[PDB]
Design a protein around this ligand. Structure first.
Ligand code: CL
Length: 312
């Protein structure tokens, strides 16, 4: 509660900024092709990532470009990370999530830029995309979006504003959404009614990702025991899911959140499972894999209807 004073203050800052946009005091810029924004009130986690890729796959008959912010990316300036699947920089220069999204989306372009509009402009010149997806774009009101998709998990609904809680914005800001996606339905189911189009999102275990980021069956470990490891401190997350997946684990290792694997040294002939975020650093090594999940969205056909209305 030491943090509540900043919380009450932070609320007035955000509300003031939001009031300026609401009332048209600040410029909202428009790119000349459709833009879909995906974001949340709280910080975006694996949920937003899973949904961004799910969404880009619904749009597989369009030239798609993801506009990411580039958190933990050296400096600034617009950067093309991936051209329709082909990575143009290392994960160092681009950050893990845009790199990971790039690796998981073989036909999608990825551009990292703090100013999303300037990113869109570069993409338009060099990539000629037909639709943009704003990764983590709900707060970036300076760029117009034709479809504003807000992800909400159960925990959000009873959270509080930074720094006392995790909300980047008050719950009332939901009004800005054109569509709601209720996430983590596999773990923490809930029902929310706003009168806006709403879609329950489940994630389910699909297959394995090898070190080239291709899907492989998990059947390979039908009669094998596995070593596993993680860095971020998500190993309890990883530990639980592995436990929840009933996978034979021989041994289990832990590393700092940031771990770069400049000196990771695995054993020839053993099999490893790690997180996609860590797998990034371990390309080159076979026998190292990540768990792959797929999104199942209720009323999928409605979402698709909403999406394609932006193309008129
Ligand atoms: Cl999320």
């Amino acid at each position: 509660s030491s943090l509540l004073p900043f919380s009450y203050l932070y609320e007035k800052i955000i509300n003031f900024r939001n009031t300026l946009y609401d009332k048209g005091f600040l410029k909202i810029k428009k790119l000349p092709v459709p833009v879909i924004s995906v974001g949340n009130l709280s910080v975006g986690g694996s949920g937003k990532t899973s949904f961004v890729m799910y969404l880009a796959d619904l749009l597989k008959d369009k030239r798609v470009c993801i506009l990411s912010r580039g958190y933990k990316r050296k400096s600034k300036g617009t950067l093309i990370v991936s051209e329709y699947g082909n990575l143009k920089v290392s994960w160092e220069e681009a950050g893990d999530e845009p790199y990971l999204m790039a690796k998981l989306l073989p036909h999608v372009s990825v551009v990292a830029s703090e100013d999303r509009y300037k990113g869109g402009l570069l993409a338009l010149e060099k990539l000629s995309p037909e639709v943009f997806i704003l990764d983590d774009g709900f707060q970036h009101r300076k760029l117009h979006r034709d479809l504003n998709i807000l992800l909400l998990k159960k925990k959000d609904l009873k959270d509080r504003l930074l720094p006392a809680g995790n909300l980047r914005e008050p719950l009332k800001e939901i009004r800005r959404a054109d569509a709601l996606v209720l996430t983590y339905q596999e773990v923490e189911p809930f029902e929310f009614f706003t009168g806006k189009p709403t879609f329950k999102m489940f994630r389910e275990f699909c297959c394995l990702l090898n070190s080239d980021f291709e899907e492989v069956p998990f059947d390979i470990l039908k009669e094998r025991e596995v070593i596993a490891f993680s860095g971020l401190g998500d190993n309890g997350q990883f530990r639980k899911v592995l436990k929840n997946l009933g996978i034979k684990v021989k041994e289990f290792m832990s590393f700092p959140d940031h771990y770069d694997y400049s000196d990771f040294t695995p054993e020839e002939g053993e099999i490893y499972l790690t997180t996609p975020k860590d797998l990034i650093k371990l390309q080159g090594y076979e026998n190292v894999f990540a768990l792959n999940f797929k999104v199942k969205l209720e009323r999928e056909e409605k979402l698709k209807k909403l999406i394609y209305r932006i193309f008129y």
